[PDB]
Amino acid sequence: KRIHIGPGRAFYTT
Amino acid sequence: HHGSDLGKKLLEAARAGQDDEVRILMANGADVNANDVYGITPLHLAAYMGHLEIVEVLLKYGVDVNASDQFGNTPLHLAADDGHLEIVEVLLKHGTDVNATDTWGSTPLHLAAHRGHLEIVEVLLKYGADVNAQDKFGKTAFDISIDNGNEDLAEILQKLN
């Protein structure tokens, strides 16, 4: 899966 | 920047990469700086997802290229993160703050360095990215490149120390 490198990325894929 | 029916539709159209819908919404008065409860705007979404044409439409309508969500993300962070070179280029040409920091202290240069996006690093440097900026963990873009073993990227940032 994607590896997030900054905050709040979960809220970009809802 | 909320409560407008067109603003919610614009956010959804940007998130879904629907170019024509973004265009028509803007042509009919939608708020170019609409945001959701997290502070995320159509430009943030288009920049993260790589919707270049949508980015260009929002720029044409005078969008705030420096808008930050509640996490401190700017569109330039997100385009540098997900590797969208042409979007990085157009944002910088429109005057985005090249050294904006998110809540982890990362500038767009830090994010491009984490990812190894060589061409994006070069454009950020051309527009004045600060090679000495440290994130909340004390790391520069060069430090990141060394930690990740990116010899190509370290080759460039080494020269600028």
PDB file of C-alpha atoms in Angstrom:
ATOM      1  CA  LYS A   1       0.000   0.000   0.000  1.00  0.00           C
ATOM      2  CA  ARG A   2       0.969   3.667  -0.154  1.00  0.00           C
ATOM      3  CA  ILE A   3       3.499   4.946   2.383  1.00  0.00           C
ATOM      4  CA  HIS A   4       2.424   8.366   3.640  1.00  0.00           C
ATOM      5  CA  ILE A   5       5.149  10.959   4.199  1.00  0.00           C
ATOM      6  CA  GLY A   6       2.952  13.826   5.379  1.00  0.00           C
ATOM      7  CA  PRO A   7      -0.020  14.425   7.666  1.00  0.00           C
ATOM      8  CA  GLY A   8      -3.693  13.920   6.949  1.00  0.00           C
ATOM      9  CA  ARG A   9      -3.302  11.816   3.803  1.00  0.00           C
ATOM     10  CA  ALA A  10      -6.178   9.536   4.853  1.00  0.00           C
ATOM     11  CA  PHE A  11      -8.573  12.426   4.269  1.00  0.00           C
ATOM     12  CA  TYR A  12      -7.501  12.713   0.628  1.00  0.00           C
ATOM     13  CA  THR A  13      -8.812   9.224  -0.321  1.00  0.00           C
ATOM     14  CA  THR A  14     -12.330   9.154   1.155  1.00  0.00           C
TER      15      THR A  14
ATOM     16  CA  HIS B   1     -16.060  28.656   1.961  1.00  0.00           C
ATOM     17  CA  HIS B   2     -18.671  26.064   2.908  1.00  0.00           C
ATOM     18  CA  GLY B   3     -22.455  25.929   2.851  1.00  0.00           C
ATOM     19  CA  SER B   4     -22.449  26.558  -0.908  1.00  0.00           C
ATOM     20  CA  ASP B   5     -23.941  23.710  -2.922  1.00  0.00           C
ATOM     21  CA  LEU B   6     -21.602  24.495  -5.830  1.00  0.00           C
ATOM     22  CA  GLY B   7     -18.547  24.410  -3.566  1.00  0.00           C
ATOM     23  CA  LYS B   8     -19.277  20.869  -2.417  1.00  0.00           C
ATOM     24  CA  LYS B   9     -19.832  19.860  -6.046  1.00  0.00           C
ATOM     25  CA  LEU B  10     -16.541  21.502  -7.021  1.00  0.00           C
ATOM     26  CA  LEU B  11     -14.660  19.567  -4.338  1.00  0.00           C
ATOM     27  CA  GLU B  12     -16.251  16.338  -5.567  1.00  0.00           C
ATOM     28  CA  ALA B  13     -15.492  17.114  -9.225  1.00  0.00           C
ATOM     29  CA  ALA B  14     -11.850  17.861  -8.407  1.00  0.00           C
ATOM     30  CA  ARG B  15     -11.567  14.682  -6.327  1.00  0.00           C
ATOM     31  CA  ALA B  16     -13.020  12.678  -9.235  1.00  0.00           C
ATOM     32  CA  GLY B  17     -10.913  14.374 -11.929  1.00  0.00           C
ATOM     33  CA  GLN B  18     -13.992  15.555 -13.855  1.00  0.00           C
ATOM     34  CA  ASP B  19     -12.488  18.332 -15.975  1.00  0.00           C
ATOM     35  CA  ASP B  20     -15.654  19.516 -17.732  1.00  0.00           C
ATOM     36  CA  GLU B  21     -17.609  19.686 -14.478  1.00  0.00           C
ATOM     37  CA  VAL B  22     -14.925  21.779 -12.777  1.00  0.00           C
ATOM     38  CA  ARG B  23     -14.932  24.141 -15.760  1.00  0.00           C
ATOM     39  CA  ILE B  24     -18.710  24.562 -15.800  1.00  0.00           C
ATOM     40  CA  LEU B  25     -18.935  24.974 -12.024  1.00  0.00           C
ATOM     41  CA  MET B  26     -16.338  27.761 -12.143  1.00  0.00           C
ATOM     42  CA  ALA B  27     -18.009  29.361 -15.162  1.00  0.00           C
ATOM     43  CA  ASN B  28     -21.216  29.539 -13.087  1.00  0.00           C
ATOM     44  CA  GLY B  29     -19.803  31.166  -9.959  1.00  0.00           C
ATOM     45  CA  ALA B  30     -18.529  28.330  -7.774  1.00  0.00           C
ATOM     46  CA  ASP B  31     -16.123  29.429  -5.030  1.00  0.00           C
ATOM     47  CA  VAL B  32     -12.593  28.682  -6.266  1.00  0.00           C
ATOM     48  CA  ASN B  33     -11.422  28.452  -2.627  1.00  0.00           C
ATOM     49  CA  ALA B  34     -14.212  26.153  -1.413  1.00  0.00           C
ATOM     50  CA  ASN B  35     -13.022  23.790   1.323  1.00  0.00           C
ATOM     51  CA  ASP B  36     -14.292  20.849   3.359  1.00  0.00           C
ATOM     52  CA  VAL B  37     -14.243  20.563   7.146  1.00  0.00           C
ATOM     53  CA  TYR B  38     -10.533  19.608   7.027  1.00  0.00           C
ATOM     54  CA  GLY B  39      -9.606  22.724   5.046  1.00  0.00           C
ATOM     55  CA  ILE B  40      -8.996  20.672   1.902  1.00  0.00           C
ATOM     56  CA  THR B  41      -9.723  22.601  -1.295  1.00  0.00           C
ATOM     57  CA  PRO B  42     -10.254  21.550  -4.923  1.00  0.00           C
ATOM     58  CA  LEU B  43      -6.685  22.664  -5.679  1.00  0.00           C
ATOM     59  CA  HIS B  44      -5.308  20.442  -2.891  1.00  0.00           C
ATOM     60  CA  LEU B  45      -7.173  17.440  -4.292  1.00  0.00           C
ATOM     61  CA  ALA B  46      -6.257  18.121  -7.921  1.00  0.00           C
ATOM     62  CA  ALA B  47      -2.611  18.682  -6.972  1.00  0.00           C
ATOM     63  CA  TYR B  48      -2.362  15.457  -4.952  1.00  0.00           C
ATOM     64  CA  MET B  49      -4.175  13.363  -7.560  1.00  0.00           C
ATOM     65  CA  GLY B  50      -2.370  14.819 -10.577  1.00  0.00           C
ATOM     66  CA  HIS B  51      -5.268  16.539 -12.374  1.00  0.00           C
ATOM     67  CA  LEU B  52      -3.200  19.089 -14.280  1.00  0.00           C
ATOM     68  CA  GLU B  53      -6.010  20.536 -16.398  1.00  0.00           C
ATOM     69  CA  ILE B  54      -8.106  21.085 -13.268  1.00  0.00           C
ATOM     70  CA  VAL B  55      -5.158  22.801 -11.563  1.00  0.00           C
ATOM     71  CA  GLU B  56      -4.838  25.114 -14.565  1.00  0.00           C
ATOM     72  CA  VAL B  57      -8.559  25.943 -14.491  1.00  0.00           C
ATOM     73  CA  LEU B  58      -8.428  26.825 -10.796  1.00  0.00           C
ATOM     74  CA  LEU B  59      -5.365  29.008 -11.395  1.00  0.00           C
ATOM     75  CA  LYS B  60      -7.196  30.815 -14.203  1.00  0.00           C
ATOM     76  CA  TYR B  61      -9.928  31.672 -11.682  1.00  0.00           C
ATOM     77  CA  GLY B  62      -7.468  33.151  -9.176  1.00  0.00           C
ATOM     78  CA  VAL B  63      -7.361  30.313  -6.654  1.00  0.00           C
ATOM     79  CA  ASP B  64      -5.299  30.832  -3.496  1.00  0.00           C
ATOM     80  CA  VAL B  65      -2.255  28.740  -4.384  1.00  0.00           C
ATOM     81  CA  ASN B  66      -0.947  29.077  -0.807  1.00  0.00           C
ATOM     82  CA  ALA B  67      -4.024  27.683   0.963  1.00  0.00           C
ATOM     83  CA  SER B  68      -3.187  25.150   3.668  1.00  0.00           C
ATOM     84  CA  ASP B  69      -5.454  22.476   5.096  1.00  0.00           C
ATOM     85  CA  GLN B  70      -5.654  21.850   8.832  1.00  0.00           C
ATOM     86  CA  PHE B  71      -2.511  19.694   8.533  1.00  0.00           C
ATOM     87  CA  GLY B  72      -0.464  22.463   6.927  1.00  0.00           C
ATOM     88  CA  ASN B  73      -0.469  20.785   3.515  1.00  0.00           C
ATOM     89  CA  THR B  74      -0.300  23.135   0.561  1.00  0.00           C
ATOM     90  CA  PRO B  75      -0.987  22.101  -3.039  1.00  0.00           C
ATOM     91  CA  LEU B  76       2.749  22.283  -3.735  1.00  0.00           C
ATOM     92  CA  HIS B  77       3.441  19.773  -0.934  1.00  0.00           C
ATOM     93  CA  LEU B  78       0.919  17.346  -2.378  1.00  0.00           C
ATOM     94  CA  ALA B  79       2.095  17.612  -5.989  1.00  0.00           C
ATOM     95  CA  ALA B  80       5.711  17.184  -4.880  1.00  0.00           C
ATOM     96  CA  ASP B  81       4.658  14.199  -2.762  1.00  0.00           C
ATOM     97  CA  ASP B  82       2.791  12.290  -5.468  1.00  0.00           C
ATOM     98  CA  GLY B  83       5.268  13.207  -8.217  1.00  0.00           C
ATOM     99  CA  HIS B  84       3.280  15.500 -10.528  1.00  0.00           C
ATOM    100  CA  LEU B  85       6.058  17.481 -12.189  1.00  0.00           C
ATOM    101  CA  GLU B  86       3.960  19.650 -14.504  1.00  0.00           C
ATOM    102  CA  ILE B  87       1.710  20.633 -11.587  1.00  0.00           C
ATOM    103  CA  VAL B  88       4.742  21.533  -9.475  1.00  0.00           C
ATOM    104  CA  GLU B  89       5.982  23.674 -12.367  1.00  0.00           C
ATOM    105  CA  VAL B  90       2.720  25.585 -12.879  1.00  0.00           C
ATOM    106  CA  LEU B  91       2.217  26.204  -9.155  1.00  0.00           C
ATOM    107  CA  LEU B  92       5.723  27.641  -8.785  1.00  0.00           C
ATOM    108  CA  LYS B  93       5.252  29.822 -11.872  1.00  0.00           C
ATOM    109  CA  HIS B  94       2.117  31.197 -10.163  1.00  0.00           C
ATOM    110  CA  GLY B  95       4.041  32.250  -7.058  1.00  0.00           C
ATOM    111  CA  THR B  96       3.420  29.517  -4.484  1.00  0.00           C
ATOM    112  CA  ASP B  97       5.571  29.696  -1.363  1.00  0.00           C
ATOM    113  CA  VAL B  98       8.282  27.184  -2.240  1.00  0.00           C
ATOM    114  CA  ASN B  99       9.329  26.765   1.421  1.00  0.00           C
ATOM    115  CA  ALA B 100       5.934  26.319   3.098  1.00  0.00           C
ATOM    116  CA  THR B 101       5.996  23.764   5.921  1.00  0.00           C
ATOM    117  CA  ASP B 102       3.412  21.197   6.965  1.00  0.00           C
ATOM    118  CA  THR B 103       2.799  20.215  10.591  1.00  0.00           C
ATOM    119  CA  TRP B 104       5.730  17.769  10.484  1.00  0.00           C
ATOM    120  CA  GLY B 105       8.006  20.619   9.382  1.00  0.00           C
ATOM    121  CA  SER B 106       8.459  19.284   5.851  1.00  0.00           C
ATOM    122  CA  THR B 107       8.861  21.636   2.916  1.00  0.00           C
ATOM    123  CA  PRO B 108       8.005  20.400  -0.582  1.00  0.00           C
ATOM    124  CA  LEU B 109      11.732  19.768  -1.075  1.00  0.00           C
ATOM    125  CA  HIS B 110      11.723  17.357   1.885  1.00  0.00           C
ATOM    126  CA  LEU B 111       8.805  15.443   0.399  1.00  0.00           C
ATOM    127  CA  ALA B 112      10.352  15.212  -3.070  1.00  0.00           C
ATOM    128  CA  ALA B 113      13.543  13.986  -1.411  1.00  0.00           C
ATOM    129  CA  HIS B 114      11.675  11.294   0.546  1.00  0.00           C
ATOM    130  CA  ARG B 115      10.186  10.101  -2.756  1.00  0.00           C
ATOM    131  CA  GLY B 116      13.308  10.450  -4.905  1.00  0.00           C
ATOM    132  CA  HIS B 117      11.491  12.695  -7.418  1.00  0.00           C
ATOM    133  CA  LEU B 118      14.652  13.964  -9.079  1.00  0.00           C
ATOM    134  CA  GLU B 119      13.113  16.335 -11.631  1.00  0.00           C
ATOM    135  CA  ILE B 120      10.800  17.856  -9.013  1.00  0.00           C
ATOM    136  CA  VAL B 121      13.771  18.481  -6.714  1.00  0.00           C
ATOM    137  CA  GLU B 122      15.553  20.324  -9.525  1.00  0.00           C
ATOM    138  CA  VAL B 123      12.566  22.591 -10.228  1.00  0.00           C
ATOM    139  CA  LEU B 124      12.057  23.352  -6.531  1.00  0.00           C
ATOM    140  CA  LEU B 125      15.720  24.346  -6.249  1.00  0.00           C
ATOM    141  CA  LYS B 126      15.390  26.530  -9.353  1.00  0.00           C
ATOM    142  CA  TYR B 127      12.556  28.420  -7.623  1.00  0.00           C
ATOM    143  CA  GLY B 128      14.520  28.950  -4.408  1.00  0.00           C
ATOM    144  CA  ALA B 129      13.837  25.863  -2.294  1.00  0.00           C
ATOM    145  CA  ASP B 130      15.872  26.088   0.919  1.00  0.00           C
ATOM    146  CA  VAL B 131      18.386  23.225   1.047  1.00  0.00           C
ATOM    147  CA  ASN B 132      19.098  24.028   4.716  1.00  0.00           C
ATOM    148  CA  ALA B 133      15.501  23.796   5.962  1.00  0.00           C
ATOM    149  CA  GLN B 134      15.164  21.165   8.687  1.00  0.00           C
ATOM    150  CA  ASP B 135      11.955  19.258   9.393  1.00  0.00           C
ATOM    151  CA  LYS B 136      10.714  18.595  12.938  1.00  0.00           C
ATOM    152  CA  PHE B 137      13.318  15.805  13.182  1.00  0.00           C
ATOM    153  CA  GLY B 138      16.265  18.011  12.174  1.00  0.00           C
ATOM    154  CA  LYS B 139      16.619  16.512   8.692  1.00  0.00           C
ATOM    155  CA  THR B 140      17.420  18.403   5.512  1.00  0.00           C
ATOM    156  CA  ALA B 141      16.545  17.136   2.059  1.00  0.00           C
ATOM    157  CA  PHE B 142      20.178  16.011   1.821  1.00  0.00           C
ATOM    158  CA  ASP B 143      19.924  14.074   5.093  1.00  0.00           C
ATOM    159  CA  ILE B 144      16.808  12.340   3.755  1.00  0.00           C
ATOM    160  CA  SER B 145      18.556  11.430   0.500  1.00  0.00           C
ATOM    161  CA  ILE B 146      21.474   9.890   2.387  1.00  0.00           C
ATOM    162  CA  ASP B 147      19.203   7.960   4.767  1.00  0.00           C
ATOM    163  CA  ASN B 148      17.228   6.546   1.817  1.00  0.00           C
ATOM    164  CA  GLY B 149      20.400   5.689  -0.106  1.00  0.00           C
ATOM    165  CA  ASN B 150      19.404   7.778  -3.137  1.00  0.00           C
ATOM    166  CA  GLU B 151      22.804   8.310  -4.713  1.00  0.00           C
ATOM    167  CA  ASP B 152      21.347  10.254  -7.655  1.00  0.00           C
ATOM    168  CA  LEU B 153      19.576  12.719  -5.385  1.00  0.00           C
ATOM    169  CA  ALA B 154      22.471  12.997  -2.933  1.00  0.00           C
ATOM    170  CA  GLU B 155      24.701  13.822  -5.913  1.00  0.00           C
ATOM    171  CA  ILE B 156      22.711  17.022  -6.495  1.00  0.00           C
ATOM    172  CA  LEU B 157      22.105  18.160  -2.923  1.00  0.00           C
ATOM    173  CA  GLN B 158      25.720  17.445  -1.956  1.00  0.00           C
ATOM    174  CA  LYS B 159      26.912  20.192  -4.312  1.00  0.00           C
ATOM    175  CA  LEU B 160      24.683  22.721  -2.509  1.00  0.00           C
ATOM    176  CA  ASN B 161      25.921  22.102   1.051  1.00  0.00           C
TER     177      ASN B 161
END
